[PDB]
Amino acid sequence: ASRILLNNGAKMPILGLGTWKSPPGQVTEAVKVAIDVGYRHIDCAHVYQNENEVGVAIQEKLREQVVKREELFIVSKLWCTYHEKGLVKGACQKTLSDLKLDYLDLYLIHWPTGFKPGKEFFPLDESGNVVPSDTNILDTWAAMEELVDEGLVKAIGISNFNHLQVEMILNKPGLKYKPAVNQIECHPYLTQEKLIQYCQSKGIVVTAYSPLGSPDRPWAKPEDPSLLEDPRIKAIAAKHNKTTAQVLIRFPMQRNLVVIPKSVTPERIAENFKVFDFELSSQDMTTLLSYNRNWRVCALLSCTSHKDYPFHEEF
C-alpha cells in the first residue's frame, strides 16, 4: 500500500523525495523526474534554501497536467528562527509562495528549539553557542494550529521531538489538533524502537529521514559508519537482487514508517522508487534492527546547550 492514513483523515504517500542539499540548479529537474516516475510526496524546508526551485518543478508538472494538486503531498517545515507566534504565519506564507502552492499538505515544527529571530538561520554568540529564543514548544504549537484554521496547511506535525516533548504537546492545555507526524532520523544505525512505538501508540505517523545515512552531509568524517557500504546490508541486498539503497528504503516502509530518501541523480531517483515489488523477511528486519549504534547524522554541537535540545534524553 502506497499511502498511510493520518489522524487528520488524509492519506500520505509512504515514499517521498528529500531535498536537503539538492543544489538549486539541479533540484527542479530532480523533482520533475521524481514526479514523472511516480513520486507524489516531496519533503521540503525553508532552511534548505531551494524551495523556489522545487516549486518551479511542482508548478510545471501541475501546469503540464502530469498530476493534479490533490494527488501531491507537499511537506515543509517552520525553521527555528520563526518560533514566535507573530512570525509563524509569515514563514509559512513565504514557503507557500516559494513552492507555488496555496496550501501545504503537512507543515512541521522543524526542531523543538527556538532560536533568536533575524536574518541568520543559526544566530551564534561570540563563543559559537546558538542563541535561543524564549519561545516554548506549546505556544509554537498553538501557532501551528492557527495555520490549519486559516486553510494554509491541511496537517501539522513535529520533527526531532523526543518522547517527552511529544508527550508535552499531547498533554498541552487546550490542545486542538494532535501532531500528525513526527519526522525523525531513522536507519539501521539509529533504529529508534522506543520513540517509534510511542508515537505509533498515539496515532502519530513517523517519517524516517536520512534513511541512507546522508552520505553528502557536509560534516562527514572518514571514521563514521557507512550504511551504503556496510557489507552486512550489502549481503541482504544481494540476496534480494536489489541495491543496498533499496533495502535501506524498504526497511522503514515495513515498520509502517514514511521514508524520504534524497537524490538529484535521475537514475537513483528512479531506483529509489522501485521498492514496492519486494519484501524483506521478518528475519531481515530484525537483523537490520540489530545494527543499531545510536549514531546520528543530525545533532549539531553548537545547539547542545539549548534548553529544549532533544537528544540528551533517553527518548
Ligand SMILES: NC(=O)c1ccc[n+]([C@@H]2O[C@H](COP(=O)([O-])OP(=O)(O)OC[C@H]3O[C@@H](n4cnc5c(N)ncnc54)[C@H](OP(=O)(O)O)[C@@H]3O)[C@@H](O)[C@H]2O)c1
Ligand atoms: N527534519 C529534519 O531535521 C531533517 C534532517 C535531515 C534530513 N531531512 C530530510 O530527509 C531527506 C533525506 O535525508 P538526507 O538528505 O540527510 O540523506 P539520505 O537521503 O540518507 O542520503 C542522500 C544521499 O544519498 C545519495 N543517494 C541517493 N540515492 C542513492 C542511491 N540509490 N544509491 C547511492 N547513493 C544514493 C544521494 O546522492 P545524490 O543526491 O548525489 O544522488 C545523497 O548523497 C533530506 O533531504 C530532507 O528532506 C529532514
Ligand SMILES: O=C(O)Cc1nn(Cc2nc3cc(C(F)(F)F)ccc3s2)c(=O)c2ccccc12
Ligand atoms: O535541519 C535539517 O533538516 C537538516 C540539517 N541538519 N543540521 C544538523 C542540525 N542539528 C540541529 C539540532 C538542533 C537542536 F534541536 F537539537 F537543538 C536544532 C537544529 C539543528 S540543525 C544542520 O546543521 C543543517 C544546516 C542547514 C540545513 C539543514 C540542516
